[PDB]
Design a protein around this ligand. Structure first.
Ligand SMILES: [K+]
Ligand SMILES: [K+]
Ligand SMILES: [Mg+2]
Ligand SMILES: [Mg+2]
Ligand SMILES: [Mg+2]
Ligand SMILES: [Mg+2]
Ligand SMILES: [Mg+2]
Ligand SMILES: [Mg+2]
Ligand SMILES: [Mg+2]
Ligand SMILES: [Mg+2]
Ligand SMILES: [Mg+2]
Ligand SMILES: [Mg+2]
Ligand SMILES: [Mg+2]
Ligand SMILES: [Mg+2]
Lengths: 248, 93, 97, 99, 76, 134
RNA sequence: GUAACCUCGGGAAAAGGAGUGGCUCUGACGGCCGGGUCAGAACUGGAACGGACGCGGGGAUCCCGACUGUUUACUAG
RNA sequence: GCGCGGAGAGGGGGGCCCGGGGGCGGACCCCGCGCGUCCCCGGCCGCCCCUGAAAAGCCGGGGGGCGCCGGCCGCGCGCCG
RNA sequence: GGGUGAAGACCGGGAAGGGGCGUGCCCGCCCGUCGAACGGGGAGCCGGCGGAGACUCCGGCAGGCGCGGCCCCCGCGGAGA
């Protein structure tokens, strides 16, 4: 046979993300001495649309603390943030929607977004439109805090990791049908080359393990083991069960 | 309702996609084409610009909101919870 | 004359936004082509995106120094309305602060 | 609990008042207002300016418990009102529910 | 090309800024028997139309030998 | 319940060429059909800067002061809590600001008066620049 | 003048009828002269007028695929 | 078609921009009228799980430091198609 | 700077990585005079002439950008826009 679609994707070429006309990487403000002691004030300048992304981005201007002038940031906007609003970051930031503060100072039961797994990594956990995390409990003896992820799993992170109050803006996007093939075309034209999708049973044996036969059908079981080598891992990988169980 | 009985704005689709999709689109599109009261000046001049971006045609203030509607119920619940938790802390410092 | 069709005046014939012409009659009873130059935008406010009064829509290099200025402390960077807010805001803040 | 609504109705019926921010500033500067009422969504910089001027003229300033739309309804009007100043209460108006 | 006024014509001729002066007699149409004075300068060509032929003689005689002079007087 | 626009008050210019500068009200005109106006005198340029080098010829120029006198709309002013006692009202009046030569004479007089007060270290707040962060 | 059926949006130009030239007139619609269009009448031609040109044949049903789209360049749309 | 107004409408009086037009020059200009076509521009409105390049270069403002900076008259503008 | 591979070669931010004014001081983390005869870009029109060239020649009338001489000035008006 020849190389499969999954094997060809990993080599780049016509399978790279289309990044032209993107505003940049969205991140929390970097951690420094000024906000390790007090608070730093900024102002929201604009709210913009990012190609490929479902959630809006906000441009926030802060004073420069190692010289003269100003510093421009790029945040993921929580719901309810408006142009001209002033926000704070630091150990002494107040509990308002746009503010950034460490999770140790956030009361249990609060909604947070753009949480950082390890201190000083600039956010990585709740970044897609409509998502949020919950602060569950604190442990002052070990200095660790428990959170609940959008998938429902529970994780322990250090109490010095920062987050933003609120939930990500743009919630409800997936409640509307795409309806037409032309809509999915535009959606994926803003992201990467991955659409439309040809079924494996509709191919010839030379280019997929599912192809061939006098009727269209999968010859064997579709569950493959975890240790299958790269050209073999197609179908359901290491599935614990299959079918529509119906219960919890 | 002089021209149609039930399709409403989904009359632009003819007969092409089925009943369930058309009903859901009726609800969502009615919501997303509407005019909303501005939280800063109490006027009904807020319109959608992009998926989660809403602008006021009077004061020119831009806000981050939901897709298809300015406010979402989870957001209201979250804001109320934050406001409650903020007062309890400030009483005892 | 019974024919009024012309020929292209540029190096190539591809019609981009910088290759627009209009037609005029010459003293020799001939139809000629003249370029239509792009009109630049005048300066716009920093705080708002509105246009600033008093400056024409020409590239600044072809204006005299007086023609590209406004007689006000922040003239040409912000409008009169935006300047009042900064003055009021700074005074009222520094009085309480 | 109590209604400051009776006072507004009587002032609107027999008194003298002005609706708007420009008229309010022109009156307060001149020492002609007896009370300034303000909504809770008035823009902050106008709030500061009007407060400071009232301080410089020893004028009483109060805040209303609604939005400019609510105040406009409470004065019998169909538009928003951010600042109201009463120049002369009426013989039926007891400007003693606020001050 | 630009129009010039009478007073700053012989002034320019005074500062020796004109390079040549041409006199042309117009006698058809809205140019009814009037004359046009065209002065060649370093930057521009300046033209004045005296309302009557007589005024031409005085001014030109007021700058004779100060700037070289031509005549046209087309009669066709 | 007391009017606040009275001679001797210190305001701030909000509009025009001299916006953002401080001034003193010398005469409040009576309300007419054009609105409310007043006559003010304000600092047009502050005394520059002088340092340890002390080069006298340039020092005198650097220490010079300018001022403006004119009537202006009372809507274009921000009254303050400060005061500045003076007596300019004798040579300052409506008819003495309409003509030009009188205006120039008044301007030099006010310039000389301001220079003194600056030297003797009085009225520090009035003779200071209002920071603006546009 | 238009049926069954229908996801109530369609089906639908459904099906199916009648008129249309030339000449001489009448009315309607603007502005402080202009313009075309729409409507009506008499007369008159081998019972003829979308006079060349340009320009749907229709209906009743069954099977397959929902639909617009793509495909074996040179025998399969 | 819309849209706007106490965060200031209508009215009266003004300022700014407008790839344009008229007059006089260039140059001793037959006179009026009108429907349509093409191109460009303008203010609105509509659409998107699609938001519709960048840099050289040029200019302005704040603060600081410095000082003729314009007018007239002369010259010049290389390489390659 | 380097890293890797028997090499050819391929991969690459962690490296004491430049200027100015003018001689002493001051400023400064780190590539490209590569890649568009359709994108950006300081400025051109008319008349005439040959056998074969013209927005290029000649006549006229203009624009832009520099350099050199002579005179040659460090802001006033408005109520406000
Ligand atoms: K599939
Ligand atoms: K090129
Ligand atoms: Mg096959
Ligand atoms: Mg195989
Ligand atoms: Mg088969
Ligand atoms: Mg101007
Ligand atoms: Mg099909
Ligand atoms: Mg088809
Ligand atoms: Mg074939
Ligand atoms: Mg075939
Ligand atoms: Mg290149
Ligand atoms: Mg080009
Ligand atoms: Mg030439
Ligand atoms: Mg040829």
């Amino acid at each position: 046979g020849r190389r499969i679609r999954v094997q060809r994707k990993g080599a780049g070429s016509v399978f790279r993300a289309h990044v032209a006309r993107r505003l940049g990487a969205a991140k929390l403000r970097a951690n420094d001495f000024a906000e390790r002691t007090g608070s730093v004030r900024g102002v929201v300048k604009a709210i913009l649309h990012d190609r490929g992304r479902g959630a809006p981005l906000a441009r926030v201007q802060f004073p420069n603390m190692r010289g003269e002038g100003r510093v421009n940031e790029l945040f993921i906007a929580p719901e309810g943030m408006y142009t001209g609003q002033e926000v704070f970051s630091g150990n002494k930031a107040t509990l308002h929607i746009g503010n950034i503060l460490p999770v140790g100072n956030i009361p249990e039961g609060t909604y947070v977004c753009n949480v950082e797994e390890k201190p000083m990594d600039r956010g990585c956990l709740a970044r897609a439109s409509g998502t949020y995390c919950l602060v569950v409990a604190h442990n002052m003896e070990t200095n660790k805090t428990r959170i609940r992820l959008p998938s429902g799993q529970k994780k322990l992170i250090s109490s010095k990791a920062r987050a933003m109050i609120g939930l990500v803006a743009g919630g409800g996007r997936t409640d509307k049908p795409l309806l037409k093939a032309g809509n999915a075309y535009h959606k994926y034209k803003a992201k990467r080359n991955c659409w439309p999708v040809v079924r494996g049973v509709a191919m010839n044996p030379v280019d997929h393990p599912h192809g061939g036969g006098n009727h269209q059908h999968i010859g064997v079981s579709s569950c493959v083991p975890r240790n299958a080598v790269p050209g073999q891992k197609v179908g359901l990988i290491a599935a614990r069960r299959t079918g529509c169980s119906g219960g919890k | 309702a002089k021209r149609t009985k039930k399709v409403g704005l989904t009359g632009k689709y003819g007969t092409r996609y089925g009943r369930a999709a058309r009903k859901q689109l009726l609800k969502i599109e009615t919501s997303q084409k509407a005019k909303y009261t501005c939280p800063f000046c109490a006027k009904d001049k807020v319109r959608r610009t992009a998926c989660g971006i809403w602008t006021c045609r009077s004061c020119s203030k831009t806000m981050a909101g939901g897709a298809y509607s300015l406010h979402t119920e989870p957001a209201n619940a979250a804001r109320a919870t934050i406001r409650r938790l903020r007062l309890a802390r400030e009483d005892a410092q | 004359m019974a024919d009024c069709r012309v020929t292209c005046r540029f190096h190539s014939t591809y019609r981009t936004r910088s290759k627009i012409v209009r037609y005029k009659r010459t003293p020799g009873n001939r139809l000629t082509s003249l370029r239509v130059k792009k009109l630049p935008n005048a300066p716009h406010c920093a705080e708002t995106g509105k246009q600033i009064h008093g400056i024409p829509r020409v590239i600044p290099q072809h204006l005299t120094r007086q023609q590209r200025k406004v007689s006000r402390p922040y003239g040409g960077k912000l409008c009169g309305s935006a300047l009042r807010a900064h003055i009021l805001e700074s005074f009222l803040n520094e009085e309480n602060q | 609990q109590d209604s400051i609504s009776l006072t507004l109705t009587l002032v609107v019926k027999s008194g003298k008042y002005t609706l708007g921010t420009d008229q309010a500033i022109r009156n307060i500067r001149d020492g002609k207002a007896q009370l300034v009422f303000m909504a809770n969504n008035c823009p902050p910089l106008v709030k500061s300016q009007v407060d400071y001027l009232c301080h410089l003229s020893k004028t009483p300033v109060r805040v209303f418990a609604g939005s400019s739309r609510e105040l406009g309804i409470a004065v019998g009007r169909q538009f928003n009102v951010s600042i109201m100043t009463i120049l002369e209460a009426g013989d039926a108006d007891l400007t003693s529910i606020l001050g | 090309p630009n129009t010039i006024t009478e007073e700053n014509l012989m002034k320019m001729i005074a500062d020796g800024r004109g390079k040549k002066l041409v006199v042309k007699s117009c006698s058809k149409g809205r140019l009814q028997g009037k004359v046009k004075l065209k002065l060649r300068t370093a930057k521009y060509l300046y033209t004045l139309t005296v309302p009557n032929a007589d005024d031409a003689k005085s001014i030109v005689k007021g700058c004779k030998d100060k700037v070289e002079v031509q005549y046209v007087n087309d009669s066709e | 319940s007391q009017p606040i626009i009275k001679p001797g008050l210190v305001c701030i210019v909000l509009q025009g060429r001299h916006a953002g500068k401080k001034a003193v009200i010398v005469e409040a005109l009576p309300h007419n059909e054009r609105g409310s106006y007043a006559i003010v005198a304000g600092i047009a340029a502050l005394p520059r800067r002088i340092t340890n080098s002390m080069s006298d010829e340039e020092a005198v120029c650097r220490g010079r002061v300018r001022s403006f006198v004119k009537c202006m709309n009372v809507n274009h002013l921000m009254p303050t809590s400060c005061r500045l006692e003076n007596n300019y009202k004798d040579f300052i009046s409506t008819q003495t600001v309409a003509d030009v030569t009188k205006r120039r004479e008044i301007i030099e007089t006010v310039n000389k008066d301001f220079q003194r007060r600056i030297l003797e270290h009085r009225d520090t707040w009035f003779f200071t620049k209002l920071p603006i962060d546009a």
